[PDB]
Structures are given as C-alpha cells and as structure tokens.
Amino acid sequence: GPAFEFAVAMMKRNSSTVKTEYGEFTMLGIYDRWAVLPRHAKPGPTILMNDQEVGVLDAKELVDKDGTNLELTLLKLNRNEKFRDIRGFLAKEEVEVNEAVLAINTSKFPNMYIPVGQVTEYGFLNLGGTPTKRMLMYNFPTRAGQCGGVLMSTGKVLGIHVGGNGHQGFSAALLKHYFN
Ligand SMILES: *[C@](O)(C(N)=O)[C@H](C[C@@H]1CCNC1=O)NC(=O)[C@@H]1[C@@H]2[C@H](CN1C(=O)[C@@H](NC(=O)NC(C)(C)C)C(C)(C)C)C2(C)C
Structure with missing residues (x-):
C-alpha cells in the first residue's frame, strides 16, 4: 500500500524509458545528471531517453574491490534538467x-x-x-x-x-x- x-x-519523478543498441530498459535517475542502467544495456555515446537523443558524458561499469561484476552502469547525461536527489x-x-x-x-x-x-x-x-x-x-x-x-x-x-x-x-x- x-x-x-x-x-x-x-517512477513519476525519477524514471524514464531508455533504448540502447542492446534493447529497451527502465532507467532510474539518482541525482544531478547521474542515472543507473543494468550493465548489459551497454549504453553508447548516445541513448534514446523517452524517444529523445541524449549524450552520455561518462559511463562507469561498477565492480567490487575484487573486480567482481555488480551488473550496474552509472551514466552522466548531457541534459539541462537535474534529477531529484x-x-x-x-x-x-x-x-x-x-x-x-x-x-x-x-x-x-x-x-x-x-x-x-x-x-x-x-x-x-x-x-x-x-x-x-x-x-x-x-x-x-x-x-x-x-x-x-x-x-x-x-x-x-x-x-x-x-x-x-x-x-x-x-x-x-x-x-x-x-x-x-
Ligand atoms: C533484461 O536485459 C531484459 N531485456 O529485460 C534481461 C532480463 C531477463 C530475461 C529473461 N528473464 C529476465 O529477467 N536480462 C538478461 O537477459 C541478462 C543479461 C545477459 C543474460 N541475462 C540473464 O538474465 C540470463 N540469466 C542467466 O544468466 N541465467 C542464470 C545463469 C543465472 C541461471 C538469461 C539466460 C538471458 C535469462 C546479461 C548480460 C546478464
């Protein structure tokens, strides 16, 4: 409830639909212009975010101290609007x-x-x-x-x-x- x-x-405030070359995913905005995708979204230099072309300034594939996979990619988005923190x-x-x-x-x-x-x-x-x-x-x-x-x-x-x-x-x- x-x-x-x-x-x-x-979802209303922080989510969007993203299309990469590897498919269509839910994307969650975290703060400023940083969002998270599953690593296997393999985001390119550009993404579709709600049908609009958006540039990817940085992309960190996350690993633990042993370099073990966490299956998350953090994205810095080239846009004016900022995510609710x-x-x-x-x-x-x-x-x-x-x-x-x-x-x-x-x-x-x-x-x-x-x-x-x-x-x-x-x-x-x-x-x-x-x-x-x-x-x-x-x-x-x-x-x-x-x-x-x-x-x-x-x-x-x-x-x-x-x-x-x-x-x-x-x-x-x-x-x-x-x-x-
Ligand atoms: C996701 O990318 C999507 N399109 O929704 C997808 C979600 C999967 C598809 C079927 N059930 C789901 O929840 N995720 C994947 O396809 C990821 C992706 C590639 C493999 N993968 C899987 O989840 C696979 N599972 C898997 O490895 N099976 C174990 C070994 C744990 C028994 C699989 C076989 C596609 C379901 C990567 C890069 C992790």
Whole structure:
C-alpha cells in the first residue's frame, strides 16, 4: 500500500524509458545528471531517453574491490534538467524486505507495478556466465522487458532488476557508496 504509493511517485519523478543498441530498459535517475542502467544495456555515446537523443558524458561499469561484476552502469547525461536527489533512499548495505514492489517503465510494460513478495540477500550468482555479487532475490518469473525495473519498499529504493532464471528474479543492490 504505502510501498505502491512510494513507487508510483518515485517512477513519476525519477524514471524514464531508455533504448540502447542492446534493447529497451527502465532507467532510474539518482541525482544531478547521474542515472543507473543494468550493465548489459551497454549504453553508447548516445541513448534514446523517452524517444529523445541524449549524450552520455561518462559511463562507469561498477565492480567490487575484487573486480567482481555488480551488473550496474552509472551514466552522466548531457541534459539541462537535474534529477531529484534520491541518495537518501539508498541503503549502505543490502536490504531484505518481506514485501517489495518492482516498477517497470518501457514500451512493452508501461507504468506497471509488480508485488514480488520477500526479497532475500542472494549474494553470488553466475549471471550471463559472469560471476556477480550483491544480488537480491524474489520469487517472480521475470521476463525480457523488465531489466532496469526498480525494486522498492516504503521509503526504500532497494535495487535494479538485472536478470532471472524463469522462476526467480534478481536485482543488483543500489548502495549509497556507489554515488559519493
Ligand atoms: C533484461 O536485459 C531484459 N531485456 O529485460 C534481461 C532480463 C531477463 C530475461 C529473461 N528473464 C529476465 O529477467 N536480462 C538478461 O537477459 C541478462 C543479461 C545477459 C543474460 N541475462 C540473464 O538474465 C540470463 N540469466 C542467466 O544468466 N541465467 C542464470 C545463469 C543465472 C541461471 C538469461 C539466460 C538471458 C535469462 C546479461 C548480460 C546478464
């Protein structure tokens, strides 16, 4: 209830639809002109953001201290408008909740909200054959079209949807220290 209300407002204010050469994704703006995509969006020097051409000033593919994959790409966007600063809503470590909402904003799943239930700290996963850490797990059969999906609870942005195995979905944890 409060989680759906939080998610609708979060997506209204900070989400957009992005097309890269590698497909269509939900993109979350974090602060200033920094957004996050799943790494496998592989954003070029230019992106479509809500059907408009936008330049990518910088692109950091995130890895932990061992160089392990986190499956997140931070993007600096060449635009005048700035994102509402949502770093306050990002945890310092992986959040587990009994009740989460996954919010999608593409052409395929426009403004849809999925109650995914319990989110558990999964940690390690071989994702696309790349070892990956900091994975949050929910028992939902996620499909193509949901990557970049934003995983939320009341007052919390928990992570970005990056993968599934047909029965479970996995989000990369969106941790505060990524955006210092
Ligand atoms: C996402 O890009 C999208 N278009 O929505 C997509 C979401 C997937 C597709 C089917 N279910 C989902 O939630 N993500 C991917 O395709 C990522 C991408 C490539 C592989 N990948 C996967 O999620 C794969 N899973 C996987 O590696 N399976 C394990 C090994 C964990 C058993 C797969 C096989 C495409 C579903 C990369 C770069 C991680």
